[PDB]
Amino acid sequence: VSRYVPDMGDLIWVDFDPTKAGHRPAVVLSPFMYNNKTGMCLCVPCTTQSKGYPFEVVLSGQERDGVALADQVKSIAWRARGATKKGTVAPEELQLIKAKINVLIG
Amino acid sequence: VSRYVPDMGDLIWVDFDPGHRPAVVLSPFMYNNKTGMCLCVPCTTQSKGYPFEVVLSGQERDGVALADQVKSIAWRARGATKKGTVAPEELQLIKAKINVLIGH
């Protein structure tokens, strides 16, 4: 058996805290090579409701949407937090998340 | 009295749980001020040769920023204080290494 290792663009389900909620969707930004070597990935958390916040990026589903919070970049231990794969975002969704991060940090 | 609010390039001392550590601020004052959050990368005193290290050179002591370990933190809630400021070239190298990881 080989462990699922997140690649860039994956939408994962990952525990964001042992003390409660114990999971949330996140969009992985870093590439497989890095994620596999380090056991870490850069990702942004997702929520279900959009508030019109400027750094929101809509994750568009067949019947229902989600929202990635592009300013809330997190470096996390995806292996230690039991990341599993929920799906994959569109190329343009990943691109927009990165473009918004770029607006914020030099 | 008014609170210190981090600007881009600031080296801050901030509680990292569960506690305090230095971090380099990457996001602009306006964002940090409006949100109470900032994007930063943690620092350590000892370089280990990790590929995403960026050496920070100071008057007395040195250390490294871990450029891959970008994180969004509640700086105001974690009691951030100012330790100093990184050189433009140091900030640029940190951003360059992030872009290698998370660039288009």
Swiss-Prot record, chain B:
<dbReference type="GO" id="GO:0040008">
    <property type="term" value="P:regulation of growth"/>
</dbReference>
<keyword id="KW-0810">Translation regulation</keyword>
<dbReference type="GO" id="GO:0030308">
    <property type="term" value="P:negative regulation of cell growth"/>
</dbReference>
<dbReference type="GO" id="GO:0006402">
    <property type="term" value="P:mRNA catabolic process"/>
</dbReference>
<protein>
    <recommendedName>
        <fullName>Endoribonuclease toxin MazF</fullName>
        <ecNumber>3.1.27.-</ecNumber>
    </recommendedName>
</protein>
<dbReference type="GO" id="GO:0004521">
    <property type="term" value="F:RNA endonuclease activity"/>
</dbReference>
<comment type="function">
    <text>Toxic component of a type II toxin-antitoxin (TA) system. A sequence-specific endoribonuclease it inhibits protein synthesis by cleaving mRNA and inducing bacterial stasis. It is stable, single-strand specific with mRNA cleavage independent of the ribosome, although translation enhances cleavage for some mRNAs. Cleavage occurs at the 5'-end of ACA sequences, yielding a 2',3'-cyclic phosphate and a free 5'-OH, although cleavage can also occur on the 3'-end of the first A.</text>
</comment>
<dbReference type="GO" id="GO:0006355">
    <property type="term" value="P:regulation of DNA-templated transcription"/>
</dbReference>
<keyword id="KW-0013">ADP-ribosylation</keyword>
<dbReference type="GO" id="GO:0006417">
    <property type="term" value="P:regulation of translation"/>
</dbReference>
<dbReference type="GO" id="GO:0110001">
    <property type="term" value="C:toxin-antitoxin complex"/>
</dbReference>
<dbReference type="GO" id="GO:0042803">
    <property type="term" value="F:protein homodimerization activity"/>
</dbReference>
<keyword id="KW-0540">Nuclease</keyword>
<dbReference type="InterPro" id="IPR011067">
    <property type="entry name" value="Plasmid_toxin/cell-grow_inhib"/>
</dbReference>
<dbReference type="GO" id="GO:0043068">
    <property type="term" value="P:positive regulation of programmed cell death"/>
</dbReference>
<keyword id="KW-0804">Transcription</keyword>
<dbReference type="GO" id="GO:0044010">
    <property type="term" value="P:single-species biofilm formation"/>
</dbReference>
<keyword id="KW-0051">Antiviral defense</keyword>
<keyword id="KW-1277">Toxin-antitoxin system</keyword>
<keyword id="KW-0378">Hydrolase</keyword>
<keyword id="KW-0694">RNA-binding</keyword>
<comment type="function">
    <text>Might also serve to protect cells against bacteriophage; in the presence of MazE-MazF fewer P1 phages are produced than in a disrupted strain. For strain K38 most wild-type cells are killed but not by phage lysis; it was suggested that MazE-MazF causes P1 phage exclusion from the bacterial population. This phenomenon is strain dependent.</text>
</comment>
<keyword id="KW-0255">Endonuclease</keyword>
<dbReference type="GO" id="GO:0003723">
    <property type="term" value="F:RNA binding"/>
</dbReference>
<comment type="subunit">
    <text>Probably a dimer. Forms a heterohexamer composed of alternating toxin and antitoxin homodimers MazF(2)-MazE(2)-MazF(2). The binding site of MazE and ssRNA or ssDNA are largely overlapping; the presence of only 1 MazE molecule inhibits mRNA endoribonuclease activity. Binds to EDF but not a mutated EDF (NNGNN).</text>
</comment>
<dbReference type="Pfam" id="PF02452">
    <property type="entry name" value="PemK_toxin"/>
</dbReference>
<keyword id="KW-0346">Stress response</keyword>
<dbReference type="GO" id="GO:0032991">
    <property type="term" value="C:protein-containing complex"/>
</dbReference>
<dbReference type="GO" id="GO:0051607">
    <property type="term" value="P:defense response to virus"/>
</dbReference>
<feature type="region of interest" description="Loop 2, involved in substrate recognition">
    <location>
        <begin position="45"/>
        <end position="53"/>
    </location>
</feature>
<comment type="similarity">
    <text>Belongs to the PemK/MazF family.</text>
</comment>
<dbReference type="GO" id="GO:0140677">
    <property type="term" value="F:molecular function activator activity"/>
</dbReference>
<keyword id="KW-0238">DNA-binding</keyword>
<feature type="modified residue" description="ADP-ribosylarginine">
    <location>
        <position position="3"/>
    </location>
</feature>
<keyword id="KW-0678">Repressor</keyword>
<dbReference type="InterPro" id="IPR003477">
    <property type="entry name" value="PemK-like"/>
</dbReference>
<keyword id="KW-0673">Quorum sensing</keyword>
<dbReference type="GO" id="GO:0009372">
    <property type="term" value="P:quorum sensing"/>
</dbReference>
<dbReference type="GO" id="GO:0044877">
    <property type="term" value="F:protein-containing complex binding"/>
</dbReference>
<dbReference type="GO" id="GO:0003677">
    <property type="term" value="F:DNA binding"/>
</dbReference>
<dbReference type="GO" id="GO:0016075">
    <property type="term" value="P:rRNA catabolic process"/>
</dbReference>
<keyword id="KW-0805">Transcription regulation</keyword>
